[PDB]
Design a protein around this ligand. Structure first.
Ligand SMILES: CC/C(C)=C\CC/C(C)=C\CC/C(C)=C\CC/C(C)=C\CC/C(C)=C/CC[C@H](C)CCOP(=O)(O)O[C@@H]1O[C@H](CO)[C@@H](O)[C@H](O)[C@@H]1O
Ligand SMILES: CC/C(C)=C\CC/C(C)=C\CC/C(C)=C\CC/C(C)=C\CC/C(C)=C/CC[C@H](C)CCOP(=O)(O)O[C@@H]1O[C@H](CO)[C@@H](O)[C@H](O)[C@@H]1O
Ligand SMILES: CC/C(C)=C\CC/C(C)=C\CC/C(C)=C\CC/C(C)=C\CC/C(C)=C\CC/C(C)=C\CC/C(C)=C/CC[C@H](C)CCOP(=O)(O)O
Ligand SMILES: CC/C(C)=C\CC/C(C)=C\CC/C(C)=C\CC/C(C)=C\CC/C(C)=C\CC/C(C)=C\CC/C(C)=C/CC[C@H](C)CCOP(=O)(O)O
Lengths: 701, 701
């Protein structure tokens, strides 16, 4: 081909278009909560409802997710709870959440091309680096989910580009462009460290690159004049202000935004000292949830179908259509509307006693439920239900039965979701499962209506599995408790204000301490020595019916080539230094400086983003190598311009063929592992075997 | 005072005499097995009876201990078993065992003085370094026990001295003295790495010091002539042969000695492949080994407490003191004596069948255990045990329960320690854990007796953690198998011979793999960042009747001063380099070179023996810093010669006063903590409080 600015622009546009294509293609396919979408989606939602929470990560990533959610208009109440629940059946915009990391990944590929272009390399080198980042399965798989690692990688690449822009302005110090790019480098580093704490490693890179520069600026005998000590002091002050103080100010600003958005009580208030509880303005749910007492009359509403637990005088038919025999007891149903047949009085287990006031119902208490309209008592037993031969019938019985020979079958455990010992059962806020005490079945319902004999109402029966979310109920109203009762009018709510620095210091210390002790084990934790050559990969999500896995791993051909070129660059530097020690140059001035100033800089970044992971001994995963691998993709491109080099660039055909072959091979490797990256096409068992290269636990073999 | 060779010799003799005094004074006081004397004494004894065993450490240290034991003439059979048993009532020479590390510590102090003397420093600097090593409580406390860290420290100091001797001969290359000191440096490094694997760090130090030298030898433009490439090749070959190949040969020789001494079966044969069991003869000491068959009656003995698994008709009480409710089942206990209630019949899982002969029990088989004296079957279930709310109760049940509705809870897996698939379960030699099949709890016991209701016997319960060594049992006797039975006949007994390299490779791989997985938790594990300033110390041995503790920690004043001088040296080097960048020398040629060639070398050693502990993420203790701290004591001395410097050494009075004051203060600090180092004088409670400087867990307050 050829080389010109128009060709550079065409290649950049094509690379950006293909990046946006690959990152966004099939972004909504997993359509389910995946490996770590749980926590970050929870925190983004908590940002949206302004309820306070606690996390060990710096807030900026979750702020970005919450901004994306707020842009659409979603507020909702779908705080994520478990891996493997459908987003689409919950009216939540997960695609909007996932579009931000995809945008950042596409911009990461564009920024890689920009870094190679600005450094002065030829077109094939920029194309090779941008293509290695483009055709990488790990980068694609990380920018697909609700995960804040894509923001980290994008911020590191932006810091590299900003520092390359700034360093080229070293011949015009303290100008407007000079200060602008200094502050921009500081801001990129600030975003990098405000996403995840490992972003500190970028501060090492730009740190080292500054230090060497300062050393060059401190030489009393240097070709480009000499600086008096006050001038070097001005240079050092500028570097410290733009690279240390501004990043800290932006970090503090992000915590200021975090504190200002969160002004309501929520999960995570207890990690703070009581003064902070005094400033979170405990509100909104507080009003809606009142502790339920024995002898209260309540309504019980199914979370998913919105049906109310209901009864009426009609009885189950003697025979069902399949010939089974019922107890012919009073029907218990789910009813969508409000009427008196929804009213149940919650009563103690054990013998009859006259009513008492103020006895709170608590988590895991055994209770009876008396249907007010018929004066009967809820009961389950091992008689098969109307529609489910495996599930227990629910019915009601007389007082004499409930406190006599059938008493045990009238006892139900109130199991509060996420309940703790002694926790009070509250209207609205205590989602719960109602567990039949003899059998441990959970009271359950579903949408398909009963026949006409059951008034086309929902069936109520006993589910043998307790785990399903369809077993969850809530108490909507304490019907018997008047609107003016003291039990509803004792808020005692006052909210004070603390200085920002005090709150920030308390939160920072608590976050550091919890990150120092609150570690949850994961079966796919990796070690730094396994990353550069992809010895093992992590699995995020899988379902067995469609045979679809989303096993996360890099592109083996691309990673192996990048690491091998890292080794080749090490060898080239060693050989050049050894030949120089003998007094042989063997390198042109232009080709030496670049190999030590630009390419070396890239090799610095990789090192500064890889080696510090050996010092840290907590759990680390393969995605932690995503930043460093990025720098690995840069040196590769440089080394293709280097070894195949004859502005002198006549007959780049050698580098053109080199990059064409390497990128075609990496493209074949990316096509091979593409299903494992996306999980859309169900793959056969023998096809799973072909991907078992270096011992990858695909668990579909 | 003054300075002369006679004064140097007098100071050296006095320092050596005081070293031998301090290391040997009260060496036999603890007169009991202490923190890690167990393992190393076990291995030294096994060396003495020539019975094969397995360890993760290189053999040389235990060879030295066994040589010391053999010199006295002790062979005996007192293989150590538990921490806290008296040596004197067992006819064992523990003082002879402990004299070797004491000799090595005294020689370490002498070698420190020799290193400072040979490098060219003045008398006060050598005295200061040797006194800081002399008056150090950690070095004294490490050279007191049966522990192979003193050998490591002595070998590192010897390698430093040997390399300093060798480097001074650089002006007469390839001479007899040159080669002699090269080989001696290699041999010292070989001993260092053949004691403990962390001795590899010394190879880093002498490695780096060589590399710099080679760089200086590679310069084509250097003041002392120029070397052609063949001459530099000869130099590099000499370094590689004396520093890489000879150390490996000595390491291999120590394994050859280890293999030649061990030609009898012993504990640790099962870690090898059956060829190796074939190359070890079938020996007499603890000869017993007979495969256990279903329907045999056996006794089951706890390895650590020696209690027998036991039962009797008495039942658990309905309520424990804390209000918990038991199953009221038959008690299962640990009993120290021999009686028929220790007898259990081992039976198949699955349905009842009439007895069959010759069905061997194998690794990971599921079994039942029938208590012969009560005709009941061992059972565990998720009911909390007498003393441990977290651990499962062990009880027994009827035949009808064990082969009926409770059958699953009667099944236990026999998991042989280091077992392989299909391995036969044998009396005596198969140490095992008994894993409850439903819950995966391990059958466990501990020393604190049950109350009177349990006859003051040991509790048996289900430990949720399987890894602990306290889960290990063994079968002591096949009670049902008569003494004259064919199964007790001993077969073939033929011993083959393997090439040394094959045995070494198998043993090395197995040792590396077990060190990679076989880690036992310790409550006093420390982190590298706590070492240089003594933030926490380890306790070795203590008895409550005499109020004597042997809490192991360094000398706080000496360690703090040494680390502070390390920091001061860093600052001095930084300031000198910064002034040189401005073009200001500020240092004489002689005072510069020393500060970069001798003192810097010492600072190298410290670094190369401290920083590599951050890369390693296994358990580390304070004694691991003993080598590096040694180098810290050297730079200190150098920095006292440096800053107080006016052969020019007129009026050393400044350095004399400096070293006198520092050593007097360190001597006061060593006197303060001396009881905690020795444990001879019982100290009062208020005296224990005075030693609580930086949060030291003395547990006598
Ligand atoms: C185990 C050890 C191994 C294997 C490797 C160790 C790591 C290595 C080798 C190095 C570490 C990193 C190093 C050395 C530096 C990193 C930080 C530094 C110095 C810079 C940051 C990166 C960074 C933005 C570098 C900027 C480079 C830009 C593209 C230069 C622009 O063109 P420009 O006119 O200046 O070129 C030349 O400008 C000359 C002017 O004088 C002129 O004369 C020439 O004609 C020619 O015009
Ligand atoms: C964060 C970084 C910081 C803070 C610190 C970094 C670490 C530093 C500063 C350095 C790292 C270690 C370094 C540089 C070297 C270690 C290994 C080396 C080079 C040697 C091993 C140690 C080692 C046996 C050194 C031997 C030194 C012996 C005592 C020299 C004997 O006297 P000798 O005649 O040679 O002195 C002079 O000999 C000259 C001959 O030319 C002559 O001219 C002078 O008149 C004068 O007679
Ligand atoms: C004098 C200067 C000289 C010689 C030369 C000029 C050098 C120069 C101009 C620039 C660079 C300077 C250098 C080398 C460092 C400066 C950065 C620094 C130390 C502070 C600035 C960064 C900030 C704005 C905020 C830092 C947040 C704070 C408060 C603490 C974080 C704790 C971290 C980060 C703990 C990392 C482990 C982590 C727990 C793993 C979990 O990991 P994860 O959360 O991902 O799961
Ligand atoms: C080309 C050369 C150049 C450039 C310049 C010349 C350099 C020169 C002349 C000399 C030095 C060379 C250098 C830098 C290294 C050489 C050492 C080396 C790698 C091998 C030689 C050492 C040996 C004789 C035997 C080594 C035992 C073996 C086989 C493996 C051990 C594994 C280790 C040690 C695992 C360390 C962790 C440990 C598990 C923690 C537990 O700890 P612990 O057991 O205490 O509880």
């Amino acid at each position: 081909p050829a080389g010109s600015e128009r060709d550079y622009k065409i290649a950049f546009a094509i690379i950006t278009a293909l990046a946006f294509l690959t990152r966004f293609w099939g972004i909504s396919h997993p359509d389910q909560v995946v490996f770590d979408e749980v926590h970050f989606g929870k925190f983004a939602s908590y940002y949206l409802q302004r309820t306070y929470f606690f996390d060990v990560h710096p807030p900026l990533g979750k702020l970005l997710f919450a901004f994306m959610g707020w842009l659409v208009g979603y507020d909702g109440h779908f705080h994520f709870d478990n891996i493997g629940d459908p987003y689409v059946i919950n009216k939540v915009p997960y695609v909007a959440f996932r579009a931000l990391p995809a945008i950042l990944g596409s911009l990461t590929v564009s920024v890689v091309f920009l870094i190679m272009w600005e450094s002065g390399y030829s077109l094939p080198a920029c194309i090779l680096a941008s293509g290695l980042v483009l055709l990488d399965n790990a980068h694609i798989g990380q920018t697909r989910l609700i995960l804040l690692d894509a923001t980290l990688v994008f911020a590191m690449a932006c810091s590299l580009l900003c520092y390359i822009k700034f360093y080229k302005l070293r011949h015009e110090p303290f100008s407007r462009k000079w200060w602008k790019w200094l502050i921009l480098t500081g801001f990129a580093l600030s975003c990098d460290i405000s996403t995840k704490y490992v972003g500190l490693f970028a501060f090492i890179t730009i740190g080292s690159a500054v230090c060497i520069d300062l050393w060059d600026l401190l030489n009393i005998n240097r070709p480009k004049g000499a600086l008096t000590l006050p001038q070097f002091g001005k240079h050092f002050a500028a570097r410290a202000f733009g690279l240390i103080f501004m990043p800290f100010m932006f970090y503090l600003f992000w915590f200021q935004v975090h504190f200002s958005i969160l002004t309501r009580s929520g999960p995570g208030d207890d990690f703070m000292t009581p003064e902070f509880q005094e400033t979170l303005s405990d509100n909104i749910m507080l009003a809606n949830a009142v502790t339920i007492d024995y002898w209260d009359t309540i309504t019980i509403k199914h979370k998913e179908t919105k049906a109310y637990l209901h009864s009426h005088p009609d009885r189950y038919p003697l025979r069902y259509d399949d010939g089974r025999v019922s107890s012919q007891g009073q029907q218990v149903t789910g009813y969508p509307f409000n009427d008196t047949n929804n009213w149940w009085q919650i009563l103690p287990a054990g013998p009859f006693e006259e009513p008492k006031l103020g006895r709170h119902v608590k988590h895991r208490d055994l209770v009876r439920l008396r249907h007010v309209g018929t004066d009967t008592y809820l009961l389950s037993h091992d008689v098969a239900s109307p529609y489910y031969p495996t599930n227990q019938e629910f019915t009601t019985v007389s007082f004499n039965e409930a406190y006599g020979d059938r008493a045990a079958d009238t006892l139900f455990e109130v199991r509060i979701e996420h309940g703790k010992p002694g926790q009070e059962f509250k209207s609205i806020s205590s989602h719960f499962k109602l567990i039949h005490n003899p059998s441990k079945v959970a009271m359950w319902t579903h949408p398909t209506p009963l026949p006409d004999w059951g008034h086309r109402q929902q069936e109520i029966n006993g589910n043998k599995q307790i785990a399903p979310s369809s077993n969850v109920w809530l108490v909507e109203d304490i019907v018997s408790l008047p609107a003016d009762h003291k039990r509803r009018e004792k808020p005692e709510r006052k909210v004070k204000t603390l200085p920002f620095l005090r709150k920030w210091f308390e939160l920072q210390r608590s976050m550091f301490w919890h990150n120092n002790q609150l570690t949850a084990s994961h079966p796919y934790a990796s070690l730094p020595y396994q990353w550069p050559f992809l010895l093992r990969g992590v699995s995020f999500w899988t379902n067995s019916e469609t045979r679809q896995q989303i096993y996360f791993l890099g592109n083996p051909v691309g990673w192996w080539i990048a690491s091998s070129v890292l080794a080749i660059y090490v060898g080239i530097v060693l050989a050049d230094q050894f030949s120089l020690r003998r007094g042989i140059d063997a390198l042109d001035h232009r080709t030496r400086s670049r190999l030590y100033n630009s390419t070396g800089f890239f090799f610095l970044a990789w090192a500064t983003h890889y080696f510090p992971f050996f010092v840290m001994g907590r759990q680390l995963f393969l995605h932690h190598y995503l930043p460093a691998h990025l720098a690995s993709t840069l040196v590769t491109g440089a080394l293709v311009e280097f070894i195949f080099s004859p502005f002198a660039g006549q007959s780049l055909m050698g580098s053109w063929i080199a990059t064409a072959v390497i990128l075609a091979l990496v493209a074949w490797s990316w096509w091979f592992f593409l299903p494992l990256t996306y999980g859309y096409p169900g793959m056969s068992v023998q096809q799973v075997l072909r991907r078992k290269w270096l011992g990858y636990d695909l668990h579909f073999a």
